[PDB]
UniProtKB/TrEMBL annotation:
<comment type="similarity">
    <text>Belongs to the thioredoxin family. DsbA subfamily.</text>
</comment>
<feature type="disulfide bond">
    <location>
        <begin position="72"/>
        <end position="118"/>
    </location>
</feature>
<protein>
    <submittedName>
        <fullName>DsbA family protein</fullName>
    </submittedName>
</protein>
<keyword id="KW-0413">Isomerase</keyword>
<feature type="domain" description="Thioredoxin">
    <location>
        <begin position="1"/>
        <end position="120"/>
    </location>
</feature>
<dbReference type="GO" id="GO:0016853">
    <property type="term" value="F:isomerase activity"/>
</dbReference>
Amino acid sequence: KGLPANHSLYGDAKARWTINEYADLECPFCKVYTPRLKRWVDSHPDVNLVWRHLPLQMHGEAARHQARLVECAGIQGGAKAFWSAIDAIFAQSAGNGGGLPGGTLDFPELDQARLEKCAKDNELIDSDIKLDIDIARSKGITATPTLVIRDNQTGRSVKLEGMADETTLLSAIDWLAKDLLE
């Protein structure tokens, strides 16, 4: 294991299971699913959520630039800024490759000129986006959202493609760990 998630983490850092949500800020599925999944995590403290980048090629530049904007928000403001920027981008983008008007995010609690420079220039964040995409492709992930649910106690994980509903989530965690619940 490498360093733990901070700005990309939603929920309790010490949660037993982590839902890795591979997602694209232009994807209409991700737009409706991400808030519903955060709700679910709110009511299951034992599970947390980590956003992983997979901007899809058919969504072009907009999805890549928006991935960089949310990492740069994390630099400025941590998790709270990161997840607020995810919401703001899903609300403000045309979606589907149309992107933000002028590429510009309206998020006045952040330093906007600073935000834009970081999306243009910071290669560390660009690398981190690319790494999530490379990991996704190594696992054969092609569409968004796709979940990788990891049990942090055992290391085991399971992949689910699509907008998994509560039955899907519960049954995946049961598949990981039904005999290790006490």
